[PDB]
Write an enzyme that holds these catalytic residues in place. Structure first.
Site, mmCIF file in Angstrom:
data_model
loop_
_atom_site.group_PDB
_atom_site.id
_atom_site.type_symbol
_atom_site.label_atom_id
_atom_site.label_comp_id
_atom_site.label_asym_id
_atom_site.label_seq_id
_atom_site.Cartn_x
_atom_site.Cartn_y
_atom_site.Cartn_z
ATOM 1 N N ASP A 1 0.816 -1.204 0.000
ATOM 2 C CA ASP A 1 0.000 0.000 0.000
ATOM 3 C C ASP A 1 0.855 1.261 0.000
ATOM 4 O OD1 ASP A 1 -2.481 -1.253 -0.170
ATOM 5 O OD2 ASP A 1 -2.639 -1.519 1.993
ATOM 6 N N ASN B 1 -5.524 8.269 1.951
ATOM 7 C CA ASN B 1 -5.728 7.661 3.256
ATOM 8 C C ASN B 1 -6.218 8.700 4.256
ATOM 9 O OD1 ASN B 1 -5.164 4.976 2.842
ATOM 10 N ND2 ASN B 1 -3.205 5.021 3.916
ATOM 11 N N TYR C 1 -4.638 4.459 9.611
ATOM 12 C CA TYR C 1 -4.416 5.158 10.877
ATOM 13 C C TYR C 1 -5.712 5.329 11.654
ATOM 14 C CZ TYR C 1 -1.244 8.381 13.496
ATOM 15 O OH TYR C 1 -0.404 9.026 14.390
HETATM 16 N N1 LIG Z 1 0.264 4.561 14.273
HETATM 17 C C1 LIG Z 1 -0.304 4.192 13.120
HETATM 18 N N2 LIG Z 1 -1.229 3.209 13.146
HETATM 19 C C2 LIG Z 1 -1.759 2.791 11.994
HETATM 20 N N3 LIG Z 1 -1.505 3.212 10.755
HETATM 21 C C3 LIG Z 1 -0.595 4.195 10.756
HETATM 22 C C4 LIG Z 1 0.033 4.732 11.868
HETATM 23 N N4 LIG Z 1 0.894 5.757 11.488
HETATM 24 C C5 LIG Z 1 0.766 5.806 10.185
HETATM 25 N N5 LIG Z 1 -0.123 4.892 9.677
HETATM 26 C C6 LIG Z 1 -0.535 4.718 8.294
HETATM 27 O O1 LIG Z 1 0.615 4.499 7.499
HETATM 28 C C7 LIG Z 1 0.344 5.059 6.204
HETATM 29 C C8 LIG Z 1 1.640 5.271 5.451
HETATM 30 N N6 LIG Z 1 2.278 3.977 5.176
HETATM 31 C C9 LIG Z 1 1.857 3.295 3.952
HETATM 32 C C10 LIG Z 1 0.532 2.666 4.030
HETATM 33 C C11 LIG Z 1 -0.525 2.123 4.204
HETATM 34 C C12 LIG Z 1 -1.800 1.518 4.373
HETATM 35 N N7 LIG Z 1 -2.908 1.962 3.821
HETATM 36 C C13 LIG Z 1 -3.902 1.145 4.338
HETATM 37 C C14 LIG Z 1 -5.303 1.189 4.231
HETATM 38 N N8 LIG Z 1 -5.969 2.150 3.578
HETATM 39 N N9 LIG Z 1 -6.012 0.268 4.917
HETATM 40 C C15 LIG Z 1 -5.357 -0.611 5.680
HETATM 41 N N10 LIG Z 1 -4.043 -0.738 5.872
HETATM 42 C C16 LIG Z 1 -3.368 0.182 5.176
HETATM 43 N N11 LIG Z 1 -2.014 0.429 5.210
HETATM 44 C C17 LIG Z 1 -1.068 -0.293 6.044
HETATM 45 O O2 LIG Z 1 -0.625 0.521 7.107
HETATM 46 C C18 LIG Z 1 0.584 -0.073 7.636
HETATM 47 C C19 LIG Z 1 1.611 1.003 7.905
HETATM 48 O O3 LIG Z 1 2.168 1.515 6.699
HETATM 49 C C20 LIG Z 1 1.014 -1.148 6.625
HETATM 50 O O4 LIG Z 1 0.645 -2.439 7.090
HETATM 51 C C21 LIG Z 1 0.194 -0.804 5.381
HETATM 52 O O5 LIG Z 1 -0.110 -1.960 4.607
HETATM 53 C C22 LIG Z 1 3.723 4.007 5.427
HETATM 54 C C23 LIG Z 1 4.059 4.279 6.885
HETATM 55 C C24 LIG Z 1 5.447 3.843 7.277
HETATM 56 O O6 LIG Z 1 6.441 4.503 6.517
HETATM 57 C C25 LIG Z 1 -0.403 6.343 6.521
HETATM 58 O O7 LIG Z 1 -1.167 6.744 5.392
HETATM 59 C C26 LIG Z 1 -1.286 5.925 7.705
HETATM 60 O O8 LIG Z 1 -2.581 5.511 7.287
#
Ligand SMILES: Nc1ncnc2c1ncn2[C@@H]1O[C@H](CN(CC#Cc2nc3c(N)ncnc3n2[C@@H]2O[C@H](CO)[C@@H](O)[C@H]2O)CCCO)[C@@H](O)[C@H]1O
Ligand SMILES: Nc1ncnc2c1ncn2[C@@H]1O[C@H](CN(CC#Cc2nc3c(N)ncnc3n2[C@@H]2O[C@H](CO)[C@@H](O)[C@H]2O)CCCO)[C@@H](O)[C@H]1O
Ligand SMILES: Nc1ncnc2c1ncn2[C@@H]1O[C@H](CN(CC#Cc2nc3c(N)ncnc3n2[C@@H]2O[C@H](CO)[C@@H](O)[C@H]2O)CCCO)[C@@H](O)[C@H]1O
Ligand SMILES: Nc1ncnc2c1ncn2[C@@H]1O[C@H](CN(CC#Cc2nc3c(N)ncnc3n2[C@@H]2O[C@H](CO)[C@@H](O)[C@H]2O)CCCO)[C@@H](O)[C@H]1O
Lengths: 261, 261, 261, 261
Positions: free
Chosen positions: A45, A119, A160
């Site tokens: 993602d 996102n 997030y």
């Molecule tokens: N404390 C936090 N808790 C939860 N999510 C957080 C937190 N802080 C940031 N984020 C998310 O990270 C996105 C940015 N990130 C790329 C992405 C993505 C993504 N998009 C998704 C979606 N739409 N649905 C479900 N899982 C999704 N992921 C997953 O998140 C994890 C962390 O990447 C990985 O498993 C990814 O498959 C890269 C980040 C590192 O460099 C930022 O955008 C914010 O959302």
């Protein structure tokens, strides 16, 4: 048509990209990363988020596809074993498109900068708790003291937003969702606590109380913003378009990512 | 037009009702509790919920108004001091109407019973934890073990849904929200945890695993259901209509009820 | 005895400090901010936290007292109108002392730095989510991905810990409580979710996975730590001592600060 | 010594019980279910809870052991493949004992009934929300409106308490933890929200406001209580004793049950 392929950049994704380019070369398909009509993201993602932002100025001319070379993604929801089938159906074309809502973020400083999020967009301070007034459609709703705030798109609600206690929202709903990060609540300080879900045309404005410097993120991109007067959130009029070739319902994607696969 | 007034039944509400009937008698307004076109509820949100259910079969012919003789209500959002102004503007008529979405609940037992909810419908067991399979649009999503499940309308999101961690949703959004009550999660048992927000036309089916007897609530009305095969939730095609005479935005009502007033 | 008074530094606190010094001058009491036996903090809990850290090396020789010139504090739990009564009972002395547990934080980098916390110590990254292995008494318990972790003393449980969903713990309990900040949980990443409460002599070690730079806070003091190998948490053998002159139970302080006053 | 074995009652548990009885017959071990000194529970945590309550009047004369014929239990933490090793080490004896705290529940109606809980005791109403005044050490702390309240032992914190958002507490801590079930919070109704952790000798009293009938549970046993005047909670002076033959730390049991195994 014109297409391009972004890669996570590890060996597996790079090689799959080269094999798909070879397969596209057997059809009326031209590699063009300046004005593609199809953008294929090979990775996870994060790679897909980067593809979206690489082409955010031509979103209405582009259909996105994601292949996950690791675990299933919410955007990268195709397996590498199906890349040959993907090339085939993509070359023919005439596939149906699915569109998800996006989040518009406007940052005012005394000028405006606007950003699109797939996102979410978040606001935090330069360390410790910060204070922001939350204004909804020009009415003061709460004074927030805490770590930060997160405004999510529907497809971002599984990211997030979910970790912050937000609801998971089906992406056919044209809305944005505001969640709190560690709010202070005592006799003196009061927030709603609950996530808030806003329809299209509602505007949520975050306004400084003392400190005017904030860390603002839009998807992965986080930048220190100085002399900020206001951060405005609204559902964008723009949408992201996906090429879809089979049924993979959102709720099944949620099941597969969080329940079992 | 034809109107009626329900009262909480304490002295304050009963007397306000009699004074409003007297005031209506000075206009072309006929008291009729069989086929009213205007239903005025004097009390709190419980009184208003009861008015809604008293007239649920004629919802498209009725505009509802609530007066709160206690604290501000989310439905009973008029003060008693404005009852005379209310009679006046209501008698003239030609006010605008606002409509909120409703929740349809279908209970199957081997026949069907259908119910309409303005706040929510919940399912619990005959004591202890129960087990239900959650099926979304005919795909098995999770096996829920815990105290119960709550499916809320948008205007219900500030009620039971809020206490269960649900998001507050603006009532212009045509959706329903499913929240968990104390789910078991361990290596063996797994639920999504997060509230789920469904658009119109999605159907969420709750299906028994062992015990077939459940306590099902629709707004305040809770009844033991025996030999249940399925509980189906979907956004209703029916809506509740409010008579509105001034701007009292939902987000201001949320602010006034939970933040400060 | 030897005493000193710290002030928030606004007019109200500065003037109360000068009036208390005048009152102490009528007793066998010597102002001494190098080796005081009594430390009086006039302000709020921030002022009190700063007093604690100003004298953290002589905690066993000092009894602390806090006066709140604003709203009630959990540490600054005396009103300014009682300052004259405070001087009187403090000069005589022979009051009883109450002791609260503290948190020891050890930071290893390849050397060790140790810190004492009265509220909590937290660990976050240089932006975005970070990854840490959580090791409890030398057994690997979880790999945490998210915004950060908070380890709280009992008296700190009403502070950051509370905003993160932690339990409020009576300060007679010799324990520390670990809470999560926005953990990622999906099919691939797994944390416990729940706050964890540790007795004395348990050691919780946080260890890097990729990035080795963290932001570490101890009460208000937050510093970027580079080349960190480990952050170790344990209940300190040291305690903070309060001078108490009347009953103000912890649970009443909780009631007064969060329920009503 | 005198021992007995309870069984879940399925074929696997019944047969393991008979094989262990055969193995005990080769040592100076007498089967006695009236005054056993060793109680072995074969099944899951439900079976173990029932063993505890079967012998709650002789807790200081009994060491408990649990074998899980299904998934790992928090009480039934031995595998069936080790039953022969268990018989051997148990027959010799001289093992070390580990003791966990228990919860005393006193129910007053105008008389008193007292109960001991190994997991928790909960209070709910006869349907809908109920109202109870929460009194801590004779000081009125909050008026709770909602679904119910849960008071957990340390070893119970991984059970219902966890699903309600409570902290997981190491069982060497002599404490009880109160969690809320769906509390109402608005401008008019106010609860603490957070779980509360009480030391020994603190008494938490739940007192009726209107309705005097409640559903009270103690571990699995739930009974309708009529004409209740008060429910009092305190950490019991009694403890449950486990026979332990190897190290299986609580935090490893938590890891194995909720993180991975
Ligand atoms: N404390 C936090 N808790 C939860 N999510 C957080 C937190 N802080 C940031 N984020 C998310 O990270 C996105 C940015 N990130 C790329 C992405 C993505 C993504 N998009 C998704 C979606 N739409 N649905 C479900 N899982 C999704 N992921 C997953 O998140 C994890 C962390 O990447 C990985 O498993 C990814 O498959 C890269 C980040 C590192 O460099 C930022 O955008 C914010 O959302
Ligand atoms: N554990 C629970 N937590 C939270 N809410 C719960 C819980 N259990 C039930 N409910 C709600 O009670 C509704 C039924 N009830 C009438 C009503 C209503 C209502 N409607 C609202 C809305 N839409 N927004 C915001 N506050 C709203 N209330 C308020 O709820 C409180 C409890 O009435 C009072 O302040 C009301 O002003 C009567 C119930 C007693 O006889 C049932 O429908 C379920 O929602
Ligand atoms: N997102 C957060 N949510 C909740 N709390 C947070 C968050 N981030 C930090 N903290 C706490 O701030 C403490 C540091 N801070 C001094 C203090 C204190 C204190 N101590 C308390 C206690 N023990 N119980 C209950 N309220 C207590 N407060 C109150 O906190 C509010 C914020 O000060 C004010 O009402 C204080 O009366 C100054 C911070 C600004 O410069 C830091 O230590 C961390 O706890
Ligand atoms: N909504 C709820 N959410 C969470 N837990 C709930 C909820 N309602 C009741 N409980 C717990 O059930 C205990 C009674 N129950 C036997 C037991 C136990 C037990 N004890 C544990 C412990 N200490 N730690 C961790 N898992 C533990 N379990 C597990 O609970 C699940 C449900 O049994 C099973 O996996 C058991 O291995 C039988 C209940 C059905 O007849 C009642 O005491 C209350 O705790």
């Amino acid at each position: 048509m014109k297409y391009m392929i972004t890669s996570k950049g590890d060996e597996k994704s790079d090689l799959l990209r080269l094999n798909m380019i070879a397969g596209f070369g057997e059809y009326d398909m031209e590699y063009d990363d300046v004005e593609p009509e199809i953008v294929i993201s090979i990775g996870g993602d994060g790679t897909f988020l980067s593809a979206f932002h690489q082409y955010e100025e031509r979103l209405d001319e582009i259909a996105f596809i994601g292949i996950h070379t690791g675990h299933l993604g919410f955007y990268a929801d195709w397996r590498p074993a199906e890349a040959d089938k993907l090339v085939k159906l993509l070359a023919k074309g005439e596939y149906q498109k699915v569109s998800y809502p996006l989040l518009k973020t406007t940052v005012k400083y005394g000028k405006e900068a606007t950003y699109l999020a797939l996102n979410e967009s978040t606001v935090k301070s330069s360390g410790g708790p910060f204070v922001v007034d939350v204004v909804i459609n020009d009415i003061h709703f709460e004074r927030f003291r805490g770590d930060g705030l997160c405004m999510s798109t529907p497809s971002g609600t599984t990211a997030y937003n979910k970790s912050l206690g937000g609801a998971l929202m089906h992406p056919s709903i044209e809305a944005m969702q505001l969640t709190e990060m560690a709010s202070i609540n005592n006799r003196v300080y009061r927030t709603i606590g609950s996530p808030l879900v806003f329809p299209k045309h509602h505007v949520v404005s975050l306004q400084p109380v003392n400190d005017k410097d904030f860390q603002i993120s839009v998807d992965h991109l986080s930048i220190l913003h100085r002399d900020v007067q206001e951060i405005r959130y609204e559902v964008s009029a723009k949408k992201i378009h996906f090429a879809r070739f089979r049924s993979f319902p959102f709720w099944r994607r949620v099941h597969d990512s969080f329940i079992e696969d």
